[PDB]
Amino acid sequence: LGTENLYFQSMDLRVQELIKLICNVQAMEEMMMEMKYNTKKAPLGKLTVAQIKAGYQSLKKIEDCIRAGQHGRALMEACNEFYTRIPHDFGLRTPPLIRTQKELSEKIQLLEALGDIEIAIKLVKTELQSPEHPLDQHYRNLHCALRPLDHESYEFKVISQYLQSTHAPTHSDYTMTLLDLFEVEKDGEKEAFREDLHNRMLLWHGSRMSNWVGILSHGLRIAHPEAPITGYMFGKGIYFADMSSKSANYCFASRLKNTGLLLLSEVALGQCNELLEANPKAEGLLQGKHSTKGLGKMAPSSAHFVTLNGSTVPLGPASDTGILGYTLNYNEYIVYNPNQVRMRYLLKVQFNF
Numbered sequence: 001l002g003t004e005n006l007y008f009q010s011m012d013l014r015v016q017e018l019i020k021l022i023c024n025v026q027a028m029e030e031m032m033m034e035m036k037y038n039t040k041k042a043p044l045g046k047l048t049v050a051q052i053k054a055g056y057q058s059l060k061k062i063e064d065c066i067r068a069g070q071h072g073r074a075l076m077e078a079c080n081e082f083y084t085r086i087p088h089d090f091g092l093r094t095p096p097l098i099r100t101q102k103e104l105s106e107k108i109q110l111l112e113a114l115g116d117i118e119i120a121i122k123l124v125k126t127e128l129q130s131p132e133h134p135l136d137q138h139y140r141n142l143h144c145a146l147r148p149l150d151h152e153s154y155e156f157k158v159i160s161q162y163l164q165s166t167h168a169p170t171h172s173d174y175t176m177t178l179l180d181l182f183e184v185e186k187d188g189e190k191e192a193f194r195e196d197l198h199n200r201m202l203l204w205h206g207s208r209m210s211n212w213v214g215i216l217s218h219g220l221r222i223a224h225p226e227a228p229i230t231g232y233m234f235g236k237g238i239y240f241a242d243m244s245s246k247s248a249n250y251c252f253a254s255r256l257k258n259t260g261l262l263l264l265s266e267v268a269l270g271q272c273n274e275l276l277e278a279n280p281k282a283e284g285l286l287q288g289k290h291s292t293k294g295l296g297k298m299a300p301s302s303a304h305f306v307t308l309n310g311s312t313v314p315l316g317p318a319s320d321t322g323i324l325g326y327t328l329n330y331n332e333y334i335v336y337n338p339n340q341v342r343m344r345y346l347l348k349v350q351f352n353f
């Protein structure tokens with residue numbers, strides 16, 4: 001296979017495995033069935049952006065009911081209509097109400113994945129009579145360079161240390177093994193990026209395996225405009241952690257599906273507005289500042305920071321921040337314009353449960 005790759009001068013084998021993995025539509029099917037989405041009643045191949053937008057609109061109606069204190073018939077009506085637009089498989093049981101921030105957030109995550117799956121299914125379409133290998137066709141449509149890095153390189157070592165040293169103490173249900181590492185160069189990001197802003201940090205972002213084709217092809221995006229604001233602890237920005245496992249939790253890997261990806265991005269934080277508890281309306285509080293920082297109780301300290309190509313890497317271990325209702329365990333950072341983000345590394349990670 002290695003020799004066969006050299007003679008044909010095909011795409012690098014590691015990149016081939018990465019593309020095959022993220023473009024696997026059968027895995028998207030299984031992932032959505034796991035989230036209770038009824039793929040039999042509404043196949044993913046027929047999913048449209050208008051259907052998904054309608055879904056968000058019904059979630060907003062649910063949010064309105066919750067806000068006005070309608071927890072009986074009107075809420076069960078509004079939940080049923082969401083469920084008509086975004087069919088679920090609850091088998092024989094009463095379709096459950098959506099009543100809490102958590103439950104609303106779960107539905108938003110379902111619709112976010114469906115949005116990325118709609119993107120993926122279009123992107124993966126091939127020209128049957130084309131001489132190009134299907135993987136090359138997929139890769140080109142990403143408009144995003146992915147280059148494997150040498151495991152004996154300094155970059156690989158620092159990123160491995162970042163991964164391990166910021167694995168949080170409260171996320172002890174797994175450890176992570178870095179299987180491979182790719183440099184990311186998304187078309188347009190280098191030119192768009194807010195290089196002028198200070199406090200540029202290399203930060204984590206995790207997502208479900210179904211979402212990477214969307215993320216790489218469109219960049220990290222803020223939430224859909226029709227999505228319920230209450231779905232977002234600090235409003236409709238792009239969320240990042242300085243603790244690898246806080247983000248890795250959003251991979252939703254498991255003992256059954258133990259391979260996930262983690263993204264590192266340069267984030268132009270500028271001046272952070274620091275907040276101690278949830279506020280979905282945080283974006284309106286910036287008043288000229290460039291980012292929101294949710295303050296955690298535990299965080300990497302500046303003593304241990306290194307610089308990698310002009311961005312700060314907040315190496316662990318985490319320690320008490322002196323910061324303290326309920327309070328975040330770990331920091332989170334939100335920027336509200338994609339031009340404050342430049343994706344830089346994609347980690348292929350094995351989760352050990």
Ligand SMILES: NC(=O)c1cccc(N)c1
Nearest residue numbers: 205206239240241247250
């Ligand atoms: N998706 C992520 O990696 C992440 C990072 C910080 C906060 C949240 N909610 C998510």
